[PDB]
């Protein structure tokens, strides 16, 4: 359950970091590279083990 | 010098500096002493936290308990004339101050005072040292129990005709259980008779072997007629958990006292967790100098 | 905590004095060693 | 969950504020594998606080493992502090090597360009490309160490949630093992003769190791008081808000 | 499921990409660098452990 | 759920808590993040203090000095067509940006520029690293010294007819004294002729043995006509103590360059406190790829 | 401070690495000793 919520929070922030990057002039590609990295860094790893 | 040091009008200086300087130094000292005050207050608050409200963290200094008395005698001497009434006033005012707290009017209603055995009994535990069951209940102690020294019949308490009383009291200690000596073959001479286990014995005597003869009849008044303190009034739970608590008292009448002569009377309590000290002359025992000069 | 709760009124001052003396002796020794190192 | 904040804040200031990258890929992998594996396992082995049986049972409906308070202590209060501690070691390394703080806002665009061998610092010197990359890497290593140093504190405060460590005691041996071993991993990787070529970590000078010390003591003292207030005032504001 | 699950998959990519970065280098540029080869050798060792 | 979690009207809650709760939590976080910000600012101010304004505390990373060049070539390649004018524009714009700082109009008046020997000379020490004698004085460097690459005659600088120039420059380091190699029997082949002690030599060549033949006549332009840097422009006192300071420059014309073929040219400076690095290809030397395809 | 001020551009990284390694080895040893004390 928890993991689910966090994932929701993470996906949101990813899209946001996307609009911020383009309002500041990054390359269309750099914004997706950032979305992928941020969502990977917000979801915790190991909890169930 | 005289004028230039007090006030010069070229550099605009008073006592030695100008305006902006006095303002900067005063402002600095105000801010500095404010940081100092705030830090001291914080380090003192953490200490007020650390401790508990129902129990002193260290109880090794007040142990075992002392033995105080009323009246309030300076240098442990009770000297008064049987004729001049303005001689024993300072004593009666004290005795009265002490007994004035055992008035029945104060001990009224069901709370927070409850009736206890009219005869000495055992300990009574009202729980732990918490706030769970609210204010605990303390046993009532009636004035009348003290027979001839109660201020109810002869307000003076005896000082009027050469027969004084001395209300002895045991120092209140939190969680202290009094333990009397057992009936085994080793026990002082005095204590053998009337060995009520539930009573802590108090017995007075003469400091010197000579004074024995000059001291008359020591008549002790107390709970149940015994010369001691009933174990049922223990233990003491502290002010916060037992407000309106009364400690037992023991009256001592020194009847048949020789006239015009200083008598040294030493009173002493007995018990297991009771120990005397050669330095503190009030730990467990006490000394009184009586001289009824008339 | 029961009638036999005598421990609540006891303190081991003996051990405290022993340790305090060991420490005092050690600090003083360190001192002499530093002050005299070399004979000057 | 606390180490998440220091690993993400660098990638944020880097993109927004346009400064040189404070944490990289190799250093981040070092953090996850070092301070989060053995210290975490040691916690399992912890003993019981002397309150375990002196406390009421739990209502599963009202009390959960992951509630809105855990994220309050980890992300919000403790995390932000480990982040500031690593940022200090970063600012210090650059200021001493010639790059000051005011001049750092915006140098990224120019910093990350292999072709500008003329990068000018604050004191006016001109830097090449590897000469400035070396200082940046000395910052990755410092950040790393500042993280292990702050972790020391986070781990100590994690042993108990209601009692102090002075009450609980340092009798856990595995947790100690963890403190000494991590410290060793950081000293080893920073000083070994060859990590330069392979992992990209550079030696740390002695005055730098201490930059994270003030932030490590503040975390410990804060949790200790945070607890004193709990013990004294049940059902208060602190217990309603920070007791996880 | 262990070495090839869901979070490790991304790391498996980092390793792939880096190796391709070294090949285009050694095949093209005279006297290349080696930060990519050791990056791959380090990443792979992490997924394995 | 949907409604009750958003807004209920019995407990007066929004998102889960009531008003006084949101106010207490928000107030706490504001005060907390304020203490955090203040502490970080103080610990950073002590660091801004620690350091000196005229000298970086550590100078081991920028040493020895590098060797940069204009134009600004990406991947160290200079490729342009002699016909299409829009091919060498990115290069000329850079070359011009660099030379635009040596305009005589900027170096005007007595201050803070002073005239120096028209022929290479020795070092010049303008004192210590203090603020005692104010802003120091730097030697003037005229544009015209560079003969065929100055942008004053042929603005393009050569790129117009297959004869390019390369203005080399030594990285500015505070308190760095350049030390050239001595006349002893051990010295490279090239350096023997024109051993002006006061000049730091710069000499370009071909990376591979084959390319030698395909490279034509390397014509160096500089102070006094030598292929080096005059020692008189050192040392450098830093921006704060020497604003408006100009570093020497050396022009290199690669005349007689083979057409339609990539040529690898490596330039290298020589000297005692000069050392190269197999990792940094800009430390002391530099590489350029030229291909005048027409 | 004169032409021959080369010391201002030198650092003894060798000694630093030696000391850092001695310390790392010591801390690691302390660790093993504590973790295994008793064979459990
Ligand atoms: C593995 C990963 C993947 C990759 C890894 C990667 O890194 C590496 O492996 C490398 O790959 C290695 C691989 C190597 C492979 C091979 C190599 O070996 C070999 C060598 O490679 C070399 C290359 C290499 O050297 C390279 O450099 C590598 C780097 O690559 C990336 C580069 O940057 C960049 O790509 C350079 C490449 C090039 O530039 C590409 C350009 C584009 C493709 C394209 O544009 C070019 C071109 O046009 O493409 C054409 C093809 C077209 O069909 C395509 C169609 C286009 C679609 C258009 C639609 C756009 C779009 C899309 C919509 C959705 C939205 C929308 C808004 O935009 C919408 C709007 C529409 C309407 C727009 C329409 C526009 C039209 C455009 C199109 O038409 C086309 O452009 C057009 O057709 C063109 O033809 C035409 O020319 C057009 O030109 C112009 C167009 C414009 O340009 C363009 O449009 C522009 C500008 C748009 C702008 O946005 C506009 C703005 C201004 C804006 O509008 C604006 O004004 N705003 C103004 C605002 C304003 O005023 N405000 C004022 C305010 C007033 O108040 C013109 O305008 C147009 O008109 C015109 O039409 O529609 C076509 O081909 C050509 O045309 C072509 O030219 C970057 C990297 O990838 C890589 O480094 C080669 O050079 C070499 O030759 C080769 O040998 C995952 C990543 C990791 O996960 C992540 O970590 C990641 O690594 C980090 C993020 C990295 C970052 O950090 C690094 C450092 C450390 C990191 O690693 C850390 O790790 C970070 C981490 C991350 C996280 C967080 C944290 O930190 C950590 C925490 C983790 C912890 O927590 C954990 C717990 N779980 C634990 C622990 O792990 O993890 C850094 O080092 C990184 O740098 C950094 O990034
Ligand atoms: C150049 C440097 C040279 C240094 C060489 C040092 C060599 C080592 C020598 C001594 C080391 C420590 C010795 C430990 C023994 C200490 C004696 C001790 O622990 O005694 C404790 C008891 C006290 O009784 P209590 O606690 O029950 O009382 C009741 C307490 N209440 C009132 C609070 C309830 O002792 C008693 O009863 C009986 C006491 C008998 C006499 C003890 C003598 C103590 C005085 C001096 C010796 C220490 C010298 C240290 C030199 C330092 C240099 C500045
Ligand atoms: C090279 C690196 C070196 C690193 C050095 C780190 C030093 C530590 C840093 C700060 C220490 C101060 C933190 C104080 C926080 C308050 C702690 C507190 O309030 O604890 C309360 C507890 C009382 O618990 P209780 O009665 O409920 O237990 C009941 C147990 N039952 C239930 C069995 C009866 O008290 C206790 O445990 C008693 C414990 C007393 C400990 C006092 C320590 C303070 C002394 C000096 C501090 C340093 C000051 C400035 C130093 C700058 C240094 C350069
Ligand atoms: C320059 C400034 C730097 C500031 C940086 C801040 C760093 C972090 C700040 C503080 C963290 C350290 C605090 C250490 C706390 C010591 C507390 C202590 O002493 O509480 C005494 C205990 C209690 O005893 P009890 O019998 O009453 O307990 C009865 C327990 N019941 C009731 C369950 C039976 O006694 C025991 O725990 C038994 C004895 C345990 C002795 C432990 C000694 C090791 C401590 C730390 C190891 C160092 C790790 C770092 C590694 C890096 C080194 C390079
Ligand atoms: C617990 C997990 C947490 C952290 C895990 C990290 C995972 C990383 C896994 C593997 C990383 C392997 C790194 C390989 C080490 C270097 C190998 C290498 O590629 O080296 C190349 C260099 C050549 O450089 P160059 O010629 O360009 O230098 C020119 C210098 N100029 C020009 C200035 C004079 O070689 C040299 O320098 C010669 C020096 C050789 C270095 C010997 C050090 C041995 C390395 C590892 C053994 C330690 C294991 C720990 C055992 C613990 C026992 C208790
Ligand atoms: C490099 C620096 C290293 C050291 C940094 C140290 C920083 C840590 C210092 C303090 C820790 C801050 C903890 C924050 C918690 C405060 C929260 C608070 O406000 O909680 C107040 C509670 C009230 O609870 P309640 O149930 O009545 O609320 C009923 C509420 N209703 C009515 C709404 C239901 O408690 C009370 O009011 C009474 C309890 C008040 C406790 C004050 C403790 C002050 C202790 C230390 C501060 C001094 C440090 C000095 C250092 C100088 C450094 C330069
Ligand atoms: C269970 C626990 C058992 C523990 C037992 C430990 C026994 C004691 C063993 C070693 C103690 C320390 C040994 C000290 C020697 C270290 C070698 C050293 O000082 O090398 C330094 C030089 C590096 O060159 P440079 O500084 O001039 O470069 C230029 C630097 N720049 C680029 C910044 C300008 O070395 C070179 O050139 C040549 C390097 C040759 C290979 C050196 C090997 C180093 C790798 C591993 C040995 C250390 C193992 C420690 C184990 C700790 C357990 C975690
Ligand atoms: C210059 C700086 C470091 C001084 C900071 C002083 C701090 C520690 C002082 C300033 C005002 C103080 C507070 C003033 C009033 C109260 C109310 C009391 O019922 C509990 C303590 C409490 C909450 C004090 C705690 C300590 C405190 C916050
Ligand atoms: C100033 C720095 C460098 C050293 C500080 C040393 C301090 C911490 C030392 C000096 C003297 C020491 C005390 C000496 C004697 C005793 C008595 C013993 O029964 C308990 C410890 C105790 C109370 C010591 C505690 C630590 C102590 C206070
Ligand atoms: C909560 C507590 C401990 C935070 C205290 C923060 C202190 C250290 C902060 C608060 C405001 C800060 C000051 C703000 C402005 C300036 C002016 C600048 O030109 C020098 C530093 C100086 C004088 C700062 C010094 C540090 C300072 C005094
Ligand atoms: C947390 C408490 C109990 C212990 C704190 C230990 C700290 C002070 C220890 C841990 C590792 C140590 C470092 C290990 C290695 C070196 C390299 C050497 O060339 C200078 C000293 C230096 C930089 C040490 C300084 C002290 C140090 C940072
Ligand atoms: Na992780
Ligand atoms: Na983590």
SS in 3 state form for chain F?
CHHHHHEECCCCEECCECHHHHHHHHHHHHHHHHHHHHHHHHHHHHHHHHCCCCCCCCCCCCCCCCEEEECCCCCCEEEEECCCHHHCHHHHHHHHHHHCCCCCCCCCCCCCEECCCCCCCCCCCCCCCCCCCCCCCEECCCCCCCCCCCCCCCCCCCCCCCCCEEEEEECCCECCCCCCCCCCCCCCCHHHCCCCCCEEEEEEEECCCCHHHHCCEEEEECHHHCCEEEHHHCCECHHHHCCCCCCCCEEEEEECCCCCCCEEEEEEECCCCCCCCCCCCCCCEEEEEEEEEC
Question: What is the Å distance from ligand 12's center to A13 Cα?
Answer: 19
The shortest CB-CB distance from D184 to any of G13, G31, G35 is to G31
The shortest CB-CB distance from A41 to any of D8, D16, D66 is to D8
Q: Report the 10 Å Cβ neighbour count for D157.
A: 21
- CATH number for the domain harbouring residue B222: 2.60.40.1660
Ion ligand 12 contact residues with beta carbon within 5 A: A 45; D 32
Q: Does residue B6 lie within any of the structural domains?
A: no
Rounded to whole angstroms, how far apart are CA atoms D79 and B96?
Answer: 67
Q: Does residue B72 lie within any of the structural domains?
A: yes
Contacts of F23 (CB under 8 A, 6+ apart): none
Whether chain G has a CB inside 8 Å of the CB on D180: the answer is yes
Closest by CA position to G23, among listed D166, D145, D241: D145
- CA-only gyration radius of chain C, Å: 20
Structure letter (DSSP) for residue B236: B
Decide if F60 and G1 are in contact by the 8 Å CB cutoff. Answer: no
Contacts of B208 (CB under 8 A, 6+ apart): B264
Rounded to whole angstroms, how far apart are CA atoms D115 and D122?
Answer: 20
D241 pocket-lining for ligand 6 (C-beta < 6 Å): no
Q: Do the strands D119-120 and B285-293 form a parallel or antiparallel pair, or are they unpaired?
A: unpaired
Residues D78, D79, D82, D88, CA torsion sign: negative
Q: Quote the minimal CA–CA distance from A43 to chain E in Å.
A: 10
Q: Quote the minimal CA–CA distance from E18 to chain A in Å.
A: 16
Identify the H or E element spanning D135.
Answer: helix D129-158
> Cα separations (Å) of E37 from B77, B219, D31, E3, E48?
100, 105, 22, 21, 17
Q: HSE-up of F270 (CA within 13 Å, CB side)?
A: 21
> Cα separations (Å) of B23 from B44, D30, D122, F2, F165?
32, 55, 37, 62, 66
The verdict on F88 and F201 lying in the same domain is yes
Q: Quote the minimal CA–CA distance from D114 to chain G in Å.
A: 25
**φ, ψ dihedrals at G39, nearest 5°:** 85, 20
The answer for F264, left when phi > 0, alpha when psi is -120 to 50, beta otherwise, is beta
**φ, ψ dihedrals at E4, nearest 5°:** -125, 45
Identify the closest residue of chain B to C1 by CA–CA distance. Answer: B128
Chain F touches chain D, with at least 3 Cβ pairs below 8 Å, answer yes
Question: What is the Å distance from ligand 5's center to D191 Cα?
Answer: 11
Tallying the residues shown for chain C, one arrives at: 40
The shortest CB-CB distance from F59 to any of G1, G3, G8 is to G8
Mutate to test the pocket of ligand 4, among D54, D171, D183 (most ligand atoms within 8 A of CB): D171
Alpha carbon F159 to chain centroid, angstroms: 23
- Residue D89 annotated as binding? no
A40 pocket-lining for ligand 1 (C-beta < 6 Å): yes
Rounded to whole angstroms, how far apart are CA atoms D170 and B96?
Answer: 58
The verdict on F56 and F74 lying in the same domain is yes
Euclidean distance between the first and the last CA atom of chain E, given in angstroms as a whole number:
14
Contacts of E46 in chain D (CB under 8 A): 29, 33
Q: At which residue do the structure tokens 């540029």 appear?
A: E29
The verdict on F81 and F176 lying in the same domain is yes
In DSSP terms, F45 is beta-bridged to: none
DSSP helix/strand/coil, D20:
coil
The verdict on F140 and F226 lying in the same domain is yes
Decide if D128 and F238 are in contact by the 8 Å CB cutoff. Answer: no
Pairs across B and D, CB distance < 8 A: 6
- CATH number for the domain harbouring residue F25: 1.20.5.170
* Solved using: cryo-EM
Decide if A38 and D8 are in contact by the 8 Å CB cutoff. Answer: yes
Number of domains in chain F: 2
Decide if G9 and F177 are in contact by the 8 Å CB cutoff. Answer: no
The verdict on F75 and F134 lying in the same domain is yes
| The F263-269 sheet, strands edge to edge | F77-81, F285-293, F263-269, F199-206, F228-230
The verdict on B183 and B47 lying in the same domain is no
Q: Does residue B3 lie within any of the structural domains?
A: no
Closest by CA position to D231, among listed B52, B127, F279, F59: B52
Give me the domain span that covers residue F30. Answer: 14-51
Rounded to whole angstroms, how far apart are CA atoms D27 and C5?
Answer: 58
Interface-testing mutation among F5, F17, F40, with chain D (most D C-beta atoms within 10 A) = F40
Q: Does residue F177 lie within any of the structural domains?
A: yes
Identify the closest residue of chain G to D186 by CA–CA distance. Answer: G24
The answer for F257, left when phi > 0, alpha when psi is -120 to 50, beta otherwise, is beta
Contacts of B50 in chain D (CB under 8 A): 228
Question: What is the Å distance from ligand 3's center to B47 Cα?
Answer: 12
Q: Quote the minimal CA–CA distance from E7 to chain A in Å.
A: 8
Rounded to whole angstroms, how far apart are CA atoms D129 and E30?
Answer: 19
The shortest CB-CB distance from G13 to any of D181, D184, D203 is to D203
Q: Quote the minimal CA–CA distance from F85 to chain G in Å.
A: 46
Rounded to whole angstroms, how far apart are CA atoms F267 and F205?
Answer: 6
B41 pocket-lining for ligand 8 (C-beta < 6 Å): yes
- CA-only gyration radius of chain E, Å: 12
Structure letter (DSSP) for residue B182: P
- Residue D196 annotated as binding? no
Contacts of F109 (CB under 8 A, 6+ apart): none
Chains touching chain D through at least 3 C-beta pairs below 8 angstroms are: A, B, E, F, G
Structure letter (DSSP) for residue A45: -
Contacts of F171 in chain D (CB under 8 A): 117-118, 125-128
Identify the closest residue of chain D to F59 by CA–CA distance. Answer: D97
Rounded to whole angstroms, how far apart are CA atoms E45 and D198?
Answer: 13
Whether chain D has a CB inside 8 Å of the CB on F280: the answer is yes
Q: At which residue do the structure tokens 């000394």 appear?
A: B287
Interface-testing mutation among G9, G32, G35, G36, with chain D (most D C-beta atoms within 10 A) = G35
Decide if E35 and D200 are in contact by the 8 Å CB cutoff. Answer: yes
Closest by CA position to B77, among listed B61, B66, B67, B90: B90
The verdict on F33 and F95 lying in the same domain is no
Q: Does residue B7 lie within any of the structural domains?
A: no
The shortest CB-CB distance from D92 to any of F16, F39, F47 is to F47
Quick one: tokens of D206?
């002695």
Rounded to whole angstroms, how far apart are CA atoms F9 and F7?
Answer: 7
Q: Report the 10 Å Cβ neighbour count for B233.
A: 24
Assess contact for D182 and D117: CB atoms under 8 A: no
Ligand 2 atom having least distance to the Cα of C29: 2
Contacts of F54 in chain D (CB under 8 A): 123
Decide if D198 and E38 are in contact by the 8 Å CB cutoff. Answer: yes
Quick one: tokens of D231?
């013990």
| CA geometry: angle E17, E22, E28, nearest 5 deg | 125
The shortest CB-CB distance from D15 to any of A21, A42, A44 is to A21
Q: Does residue B5 lie within any of the structural domains?
A: no
Whether chain E has a CB inside 8 Å of the CB on D198: the answer is yes
Quick one: tokens of B291?
């001289």
The verdict on B44 and B111 lying in the same domain is no
The verdict on B47 and B118 lying in the same domain is no
Q: Does residue F3 lie within any of the structural domains?
A: no
Chain A touches chain C, with at least 3 Cβ pairs below 8 Å, answer no
> Cα separations (Å) of D131 from D134, E33, F74?
5, 16, 19
The verdict on B47 and B163 lying in the same domain is no
Q: Quote the minimal CA–CA distance from A28 to chain D in Å.
A: 14
B127 pocket-lining for ligand 8 (C-beta < 6 Å): no
Identify the closest residue of chain A to E6 by CA–CA distance. Answer: A45
The verdict on F151 and F38 lying in the same domain is no
Decide if D101 and F238 are in contact by the 8 Å CB cutoff. Answer: no
The verdict on B135 and B105 lying in the same domain is yes
């Amino acid at each position: 359950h928890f993991i689910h919520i966090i994932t929701g929070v993470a996906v949101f922030l990813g899209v946001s970091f996307f609009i911020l990057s383009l309002i500041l002039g990054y390359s269309w590609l750099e914004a997706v590279i950032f979305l992928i990295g941020i969502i990977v860094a917000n979801v915790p790893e190991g909890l169930l083990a | 010098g005289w004028k230039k040091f007090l006030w010069d009008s070229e550099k605009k200086e008073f006592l030695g500096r100008t305006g902006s300087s006095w303002f900067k130094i005063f402002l600095f000292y105000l801010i500095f002493y404010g940081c100092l005050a705030g830090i001291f207050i914080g380090t003192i608050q953490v200490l007020l936290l650390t401790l508990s409200d129902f129990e002193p963290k260290y109880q090794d200094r007040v142990a075992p308990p002392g033995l105080s008395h009323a009246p309030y005698a300076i240098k442990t001497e009770i000297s008064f004339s049987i004729s001049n009434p303005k001689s024993y006033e300072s004593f009666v005012k004290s005795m009265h101050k002490l007994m004035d707290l055992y008035n029945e009017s104060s001990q009224a209603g069901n709370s927070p005072f409850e009736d206890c055995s009219d005869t000495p009994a055992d300990y009574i535990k009202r729980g732990d040292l918490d706030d769970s069951q609210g204010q605990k209940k303390a046993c009532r102690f009636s004035r009348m129990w003290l027979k001839n020294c109660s201020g109810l019949d002869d307000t003076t308490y005896g000082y009027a005709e050469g027969k004084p009383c001395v209300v002895a009291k045991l120092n209140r200690i939190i969680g202290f259980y009094p333990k009397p000596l057992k009936n085994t073959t080793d026990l002082p001479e005095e204590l053998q008779a009337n060995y009520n286990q539930y009573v802590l014995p108090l017995r007075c005597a003469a400091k010197r072997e000579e004074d024995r003869e000059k001291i008359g009849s020591i008549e002790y008044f107390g709970l149940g007629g015994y010369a001691g303190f009933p174990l049922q009034y223990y233990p003491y739970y502290g002010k916060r958990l037992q407000k309106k608590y009364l400690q037992p008292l023991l009256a001592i009448q020194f009847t048949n006292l020789t006239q015009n002569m200083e008598l040294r009377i030493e009173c002493k309590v007995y018990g297991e967790n009771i120990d005397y000290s050669e330095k503190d002359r009030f730990r467990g025992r006490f000394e009184v100098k009586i001289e009824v000069k008339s | 905590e029961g009638p036999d709760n005598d421990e609540r009124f006891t303190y081991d001052y003996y051990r405290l004095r022993v340790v305090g003396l060991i420490v005092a002796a050690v600090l003083c020794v360190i001192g002499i060693i530093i002050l005299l190192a070399g004979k000057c | 969950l606390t180490s998440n904040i220091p690993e993400i804040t660098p990638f944020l200031v880097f993109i927004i504020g346009n400064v040189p990258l404070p944490l990289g890929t190799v250093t981040i992998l070092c953090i996850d594998l070092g301070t989060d594996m053995v210290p975490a396992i040691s916690l399992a082995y912890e003993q019981a606080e002397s309150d375990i049986m002196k406390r009421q049972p739990r209502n599963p409906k009202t009390d959960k493992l992951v509630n809105e308070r855990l994220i309050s202590m980890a992300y919000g209060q403790i995390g932000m502090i480990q982040a500031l501690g690593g940022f200090f070691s970063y600012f210090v390394i650059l200021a001493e090597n010639g790059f000051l703080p005011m001049d750092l806002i915006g140098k990224r665009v120019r910093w990350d360009d292999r072709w500008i061998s003329d990068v000018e610092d604050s004191f006016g010197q001109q830097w090449t490309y590897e000469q400035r990359k070396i200082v940046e890497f000395t910052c990755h290593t410092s950040f790393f160490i500042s993280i292990v140093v702050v972790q020391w504190a986070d781990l100590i405060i994690c042993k108990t949630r209601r009692n102090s460590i002075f009450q609980q005691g340092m009798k856990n041996k595995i947790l100690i093992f963890g403190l000494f071993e991590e410290t060793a991993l950081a000293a080893f990787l920073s000083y070994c003769p060859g990590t330069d070529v392979a992992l990209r970590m550079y030696p740390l000078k002695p005055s730098w190791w201490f930059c994270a010390f003030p932030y490590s003591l503040i975390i410990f003292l804060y949790d200790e008081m945070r607890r004193f207030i709990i013990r004294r005032s049940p059902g208060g504001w602190v217990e309603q808000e920070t007791y996880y | 499921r262990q070495l090839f699950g869901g979070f490790s998959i991304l790391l498996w990519i980092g390793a792939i990409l880096c190796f391709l970065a070294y090949g285009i280098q050694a095949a093209t540029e005279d006297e290349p660098a080696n930060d990519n080869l050791y990056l791959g050798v380090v990443l792979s060792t992490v997924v394995i452990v």
